[PDB]
Ligand binder design. Sequence first.
Ligand SMILES: CC[C@@H](Oc1cccc(CN(CCCOc2ccc(OC)cc2)c2nc3ccccc3o2)c1)C(=O)O
Lengths: 259, 10
Amino acid sequence: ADLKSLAKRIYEAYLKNFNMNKVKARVILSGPPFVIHDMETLCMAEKTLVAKLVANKEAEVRIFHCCQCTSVETVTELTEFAKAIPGFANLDLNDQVTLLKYGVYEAIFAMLSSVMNKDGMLVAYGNGFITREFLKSLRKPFCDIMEPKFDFAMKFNALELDDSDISLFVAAIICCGDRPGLLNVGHIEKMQEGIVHVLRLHLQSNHPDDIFLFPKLLQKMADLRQLVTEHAQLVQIIKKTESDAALHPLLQEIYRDMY
Amino acid sequence: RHKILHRLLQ
Ligand SMILES: CC[C@@H](Oc1cccc(CN(CCCOc2ccc(OC)cc2)c2nc3ccccc3o2)c1)C(=O)O
């Protein structure tokens, strides 16, 4: 097996399939995005960037809807990306579904880090920047959505990964053999072992300065599973208690029976 | 149980 070539293949699949990556994000964050820091600038950004949405419910529920729309888009990109991981498409369709069901929000929050800095995050395909303080200012429970993801991102970004690392990390998130309900655990474990081996060797080559980077990222995978469990609980509270905050059907299917 | 995912995956 050629593990350098496998790493390149997964990186190329990531560059093709994701509209946002860390290179693109950093170009934008380096200074154009419309800055959303208060209700006036939220409403202005909505009229330009999501006009049909405001052509109205509470601002918090509009933001929640925009968040979900981004997730739906990213799930679609993740499904196409997954098709490129060796062995993934040879799995039973039911196992492909299970792996994606549990893995997509761990991958979403990992990749979200690339558009975040300590002051805010890119939104709407890089055409908006919403401040972290504005999101904290929203009424409960909506102000509790993003802050844990910023906290994860600040530590994740301190690892100084590049897109070649992240592509492999996202592939390893998707190929977890301990998801509930898998049929062919043995084949998935071997697929995972192979991707994790590619990740290990890549980090050794690309980050010779950080000899613990691989176990740091194994821990981040475990942190992400916990972040997703907590996020799913918050989504359930919102769904149950906020009638205007409908869930998109693909996201309802993902969250249903997850944790 | 996941008709949209199933459809996206095909
Ligand atoms: C709420 C329920 C929803 O939770 C979340 C929680 C955190 C993050 C997301 C998805 N997300 C944030 C989009 C905000 O999108 C707007 C757009 C416009 C706007 O105002 C005009 C405000 C917010 C995102 N961004 C990404 C960028 C790169 C890679 C992956 C990315 O994932 C959904 C879920 O569970 O799906």
